[PDB]
Symmetry: D2
Subunit: 483 residues, 4 copies
């Protein structure tokens, strides 16, 4: 069983904790990210084959600490940054000299040299280890780079193995998870899919399941999962909310109605969304509106069915994790998956690459990209602008060099040449970013020649657009979307 | 000493480069005028040129060749020179081989051929030259790249010598205007100033003159010329319309009031222009209001002054050329824009001010899209200041023709400590201008753009997001309105 | 057994054929790359779980052109034809090719096949599956179905599902084929039903087992160069027969700075190997004395090293085995012989070297030629020239690594130029040349467009810091018309 | 016409920018001489400057033996302009005081001075005039002499400009001669044309006319020989003498086998078949190669080439009866660095030589060619000079320059050439290999006599040239690029 060998990752608040989880996932082992403030009851219920304590911005000199069971549970424990500093007490690029044999790092040598010692290229106080620990690696600024009670199988590392900059970090996480915690590598996209199917089948039986099909990654893979498990019993509602991209409805239907043979209720709700949105300039109002009409449309569509006892949903593990930060049943095949696993299993389920590695598209769609009041003519204009932008972006092989690209409609009038020189028309902003984390994203240094080709195209080819600007504001101090 | 004694008639055959040719002639210190090609024997005879230039189916007046003065045809001018004297015409860097001796290019060599023959590096068609002309230079594509009737002192070149791409073009221009045409170079900043003062004094005498002092290049140099000519008898009216750059009023007042001793009437009229603009969204109406309120204010101040008999004005020669179908002092009406700067330097004005990017008459009124409001103008001024501050630090101010900031009355979200706040967006706009019809948006460095947008969003309370106008002209325009 | 599931890959002459092989290896499945001109007895003896017929430049329309042995299609195993492999399978099975004396291409999947079922990169506006492939046939066999199409290429993919014959006109082995690896995975793991036992941990365990069966308690001589193959080899025999393995490391005086100290400290003082160290600097130098001919120097360096190695070998009799780092590419291009790496490709040797415990930086270090500095010192090889070269090269590589440029080139090194150049406090000293290449194939190398300020930095460090070097130049000559080494 | 009548004395205190001052004043149309600071009142009285400019320098007036102007500088009754050090020694030598301590800066003008009245680059917010100047942040005047006034200042430079308006003494802590001082030229012109009242009679056309007249009055109708090398200096000298004494000028062009590809023909085609000079063309390639045979020492090679050049020239001289005059192209920098002698360019800087060269009819690209050393390929062929090597180098170099001109990179460098390395490398030949010579491309952006940076030529450009030389020149296996700056290396390899 694929959840059997499982890592409990305890989050002391690093931005890299989910990266550790994703690395364990990549290594083929289930794992779970909980907050540090967990009860020995819970760790005993999860029953981890090993524990991992993640980095932290706090300090053990105040203060987040592991539930003492972490070290009493008799499973190998791996501390990382804070997780190492908290393992003690409770018991930029750099190179560490391996000063001892440890289970964790034996055989793993990036450079050696030192003339008589193994070196580790790692990506990086602890004044003294517990009495049962040895020093395993050391640096100038950190004599305690790796510490280990190799008998109790506790390991401590002042660097981040989950990050690629740690030359052999993954081999180290492999060592801890596969070899020191003797975990089998059962958590494979093929076997996740079988687990998904089995669990949906068992949880829903012959009951009818409904699902909001966006065409996006999460609800698509969910569609494919539900569909593989209960076939025709699944009904997907595709709402064209009048806020999608150019031809999005066609593409979602060509893909999932035709190509994959899904049972699709197609709801053309453009006028209805644009109705409810009428005269609404407040971006948070628009979101709530757009989100409410969606819930309205699905509940209407659900009733037109019958015996629909289950709503399916593209909830992925990160979503569960924020919810962790404090009618119809829920079918959530992806609740345990991170986004890269979802894509990977989407590939195995047969979905196309393009869709799976597409830029995220917001729920509210163009509703948050038409500044202020959302009008059809602004959305049609926005659509042709985005289409050109994204089509040029794809020609130039720039689509994968940015996390997200789109255009924003500015309801301001600017003059542009018409032939005699007298036509005001609308302005759009191109927006392209390289996303670093949920808090920070850089605006993309798209090439000048390229920007200008897109500019000219949008202005010349779209009647109603006279001027194109580029969002040159990063996040912070701005955000990715304009609303 | 008439600095207009030696003069060059340049006939404009519609080329972009014709005002370039005239400026080159003015750079050699020789006065010249640029007329439309369609002139009369009479119009030309009255000018009495020391030499005629024809720029790049229109035809020169037959008198141009009858006039007995040297004539220089460039591109279309050389082609039209061939047509009209019995030749024949049929329609990038290049090198023309000089194949005959000619006053125009005698001694002007850029390289030598393998044969050992002279070559000209030029920037650029005739198939038969008149029977009294010879072939001066040629190249593979252009059999007749330079031709000359050495006797009538007629010279045609297919390339443009006014463009520095023609390696020694200026020297051929110098050769025709100074040697062939027999011109002294008295047209100098210092002497143009003297002649401007002389002509102002003679036309105005002891009368008091009034002047609209916009702070721009033209009205400033006009102000300094008048102040030099008539001093206390000059009142400049400076009108802060509410649409000027940050501290423009203080700056113009500092400069001409305290520093230069001009007599200034400062009209703080921000509320007045803003109020005449309240609610107006149409840029055509905004400009008309701003212009309308401008003369109203200026008229109300001209009636506030005893014995004002003359209006001074920074009309420059291109304004005169562009104009092609109380007394008026226009000291700059013969000067091209760079000449006006050169003399503004000799009159003691500051370089920064003379080479400043042009600012439009309505100012921020065409840069706050829609209803111009004080709030938006305030934000715009701060953002714009940060932009130019940085442009100058980066030595990029020199590198664009115009750089400014447009206020977009759209709300965008941005970070506000731990959460979010909606505020206004501005667009940076920077162009390299090419002509009245053509401008490329500047490829400002990315790092620089990032600094500026950070500076604006972080430093300007009320701005959350900054975009860069990446639209060229055409299909867009330089200004947003 | 980790060779049980195995893919026979027949080589029809493509450049990318070794890449097909290594992708099967990357997949976790043993495979073998043979010339196409083999026999049924050979295939039968090999017992493929599946056969891949790879690309090739020749035309199927020519007179005596390559054909797959007819048994390929009678082995009752799956057959995968890639490009010419597919053109030969179509021609050998009833269909036709027209001849025509590369590119990115999107092929539309127009029918189901086990090979590309569910492998999609995009949809057409008409809902049809698209594959992003690295492209390169007028009729297919009449038991074959068309699987995918292009404009240019009507039969991009053909297949006989019953017989498990799949032909593609693109290169799944090339990363440009977006889901190439998946199709190869599909063929090998799903269709050929191979397990992924070909792993580094298991290839090591296999290596050890096969050394012990072959050698037992016998004694084994090895030439330890510190290079990648000789060293992983040493680790395998050592993990296999400990003290019964002896490593002869000859410091020929033509090695990089402190190479002897480093080879010895690492494999003797850290991996507990038993190494006889021939400190043979003066002997190689004496032999090379007065030889300005690169060909003659290569010989001389070869001759002496054999002489030295033989002498050290005789000195430990009752040794019946010479071990050697020969790797699978050596096999493909070509006391008793022990060769643990003879089935491994270079990146496997590296991968298993990491499992053996070896340092990354050593396993991914640039190749250092047999003659070492004997061929990087133009003309007469002298102690002093090698000495300057070693200091110069050490500076170059040190800068090159801290600039994170070692990853970015195939080979970086310094060549000593016996020419005098003026420099400042005015002195005449030697010239060295930096040389850094990006090696496309065996015959093509681009000189690296190393940053200018980096080049200027390396260049100043070498001049200022190496007493004896007045001037640094950079080889801006690619292969062809020049070669990688200078001699 | 006396075109030297007005003249500025520049006293060199050692600034890297002193030559620039001299050329700016020249550019303004006013003759000027550049002397060392330690000259004598006597010498200055002889020159009789219309005005004196004291340049900057690296020394410090606060140090014991620091350079000072001849006191007469301040007693000659002419305007004195002091630039940095010259300002600081003007202060100190007049009762000021300097304290011991380059960049852009804005000096605020605070008093009227003939030097900068009307010269303004910006204003302060407070509305006060600013000059944009290129300053030396080093030593600073902290007291100005009694009858001086502060003209300009910064928060860090109380006396950024000082002036004694009556004595026409001006000191600036910045460099008006460098472009980075926005209106420095106008400052220099203000001093030279206005305050010193120099007429701008030092123009190319007038310099020519003056040279001619000085030639025609030094030699009259005598015969004059001239080593013509096609280099800028002797070419301009040749044309001066041609216009001056015409037929009596005999030009000797020596092809020493160390010239660039076809150089003899293009020099012959140019100055013989086109400009009409009388060229005695000596083909002495075998004579130089012979004398050079077996000489691997670059210092010996240079002496040999020098010596052998002189014998050839003396012989050609002997073949002409009554050669009473030797013309050379010595330019003023050669004087500053240091048969009757005619040196028409001894007062001219290199740009002035080009400028008058163009006025004489010489082609631009010749006048602006990179400097070619006197020994030619003999110091670009490393070790022993042989014809096979020079033929190679010539072919290789001409490819180099041809491409360099094509890509508009020729004028982006001060010198570009190829060095023949007597080292052999292997290369591809067909399917097998070949073994042939190596050449080095060498290209520099020269900043001064002691500083050259190697050019960041475009990689694709380098590889194109690379391939061309190797694929087009027989005898070359490989091309390298010199990536050594000067210092620690030199421009030439030998
Ligand atoms: O499903 C969604 N509903 C929303 O209302 C929404 N708002 C922002 N986003 C996405 O969140 C990411 C970060 O955008 P911001 O930096 O503007 O917050 C980007 O990926 C945005 O597209 C949304 N997604
Ligand atoms: O004095 C002015 N009053 C105006 O109303 C005006 N509108 C445009 N401009 C200037 O014209 C140039 C380019 O015009 P466009 O904005 O139409 O491209 C640029 O120099 C613009 O600033 C104006 N100048
Ligand atoms: O082990 C070796 N012994 C040798 O004698 C030898 N010669 C060249 N090389 C390597 O061959 C590759 C290309 O060399 P060339 O382009 O100079 O032929 C590069 O990888 C060179 O290092 C050698 N390797
Ligand atoms: O050594 C030389 N002998 C000569 O006869 C000679 N003539 C000119 N040049 C130029 O002088 C400069 C100095 O060269 P270095 O950077 O190698 O010292 C470089 O600019 C050289 O080209 C010569 N150099």
């Amino acid at each position: 069983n694929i959840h059997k060998h499982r890592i409990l990752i305890l989050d002391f608040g690093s931005q890299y904790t989910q990266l550790v989880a994703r690395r364990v996932r990549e290594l083929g082992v289930y794992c779970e990210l909980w907050a540090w403030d967990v009860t020995e009851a819970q760790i005993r219920d999860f029953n981890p084959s090993g524990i991992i304590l993640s980095g932290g911005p706090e300090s053990t000199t105040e203060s987040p600490r592991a539930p003492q069971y972490v070290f009493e549970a008799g499973v190998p424990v791996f501390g990382v940054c804070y997780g190492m500093q908290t393992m003690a007490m409770q018991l930029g690029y750099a190179q560490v000299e391996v000063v001892n044999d440890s289970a964790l790092v034996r055989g793993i040598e990036d450079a050696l040299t030192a003339d008589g010692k193994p070196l580790l290229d790692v990506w990086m106080k602890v004044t003294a280890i517990p009495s049962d620990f040895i020093t395993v690696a050391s640096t100038e600024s950190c004599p305690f780079a790796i510490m280990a009670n190799e008998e109790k199988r506790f390991y401590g590392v002042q660097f981040h193995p989950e990050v690629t900059h740690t030359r052999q970090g993954m081999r180290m996480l492999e060592r801890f998870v596969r070899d020191i915690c003797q975990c089998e590598a059962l958590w494979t996209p093929a076997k996740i899919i079988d687990d998904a199917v089995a669990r949906i089948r068992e949880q829903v039986g012959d009951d009818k399941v409904i699902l909001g099909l966006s065409g996006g990654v999460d609800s698509s893979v969910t569609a494919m999962l539900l569909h593989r498990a209960i076939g025709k019993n699944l009904t997907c509602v595709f709402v064209d909310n009048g806020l999608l991209r150019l031809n999005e409805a066609e593409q979602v239907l060509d893909m999932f109605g035709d190509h994959f043979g899904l049972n699709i209720v197609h709801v053309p709700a453009e006028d209805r969304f644009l109705s409810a949105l009428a005269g609404e300039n407040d971006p948070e109002a628009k979101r709530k509106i757009i989100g409410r009409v969606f819930v309205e449309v699905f509940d209407e569509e659900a009733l037109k069915l019958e015996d629909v006892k289950w709503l399916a949903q593209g909830t992925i593990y990160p979503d569960v994790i924020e919810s962790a930060a404090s009618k119809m049943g829920l079918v959530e095949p992806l609740k345990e998956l991170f986004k890269d696993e979802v894509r990977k299993i989407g590939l195995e389920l047969g979905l196309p690459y393009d869709m799976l590695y597409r830029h995220p598209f917001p729920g509210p769609g163009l509703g948050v990209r038409v500044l202020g009041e959302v009008k059809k003519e602004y959305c049609d204009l926005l659509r042709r602008a985005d289409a050109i932008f994204i089509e040029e972006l794809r020609k130039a092989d720039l689509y994968d060099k940015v996390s997200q690209a789109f255009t924003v409609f500015l309801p301001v009038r600017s003059v542009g040449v018409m032939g005699d020189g007298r036509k005001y028309d609308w302005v759009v902003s191109l927006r392209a970013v390289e996303t670093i984390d949920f808090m920070t994203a850089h605006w993309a240094h798209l090439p000048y020649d390229f920007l200008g080709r897109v500019s000219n195209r949008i202005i010349n080819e779209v009647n109603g657009i006279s001027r194109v600007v580029y969002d040159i504001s990063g996040k912070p101090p701005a955000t990715i979307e304009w609303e």
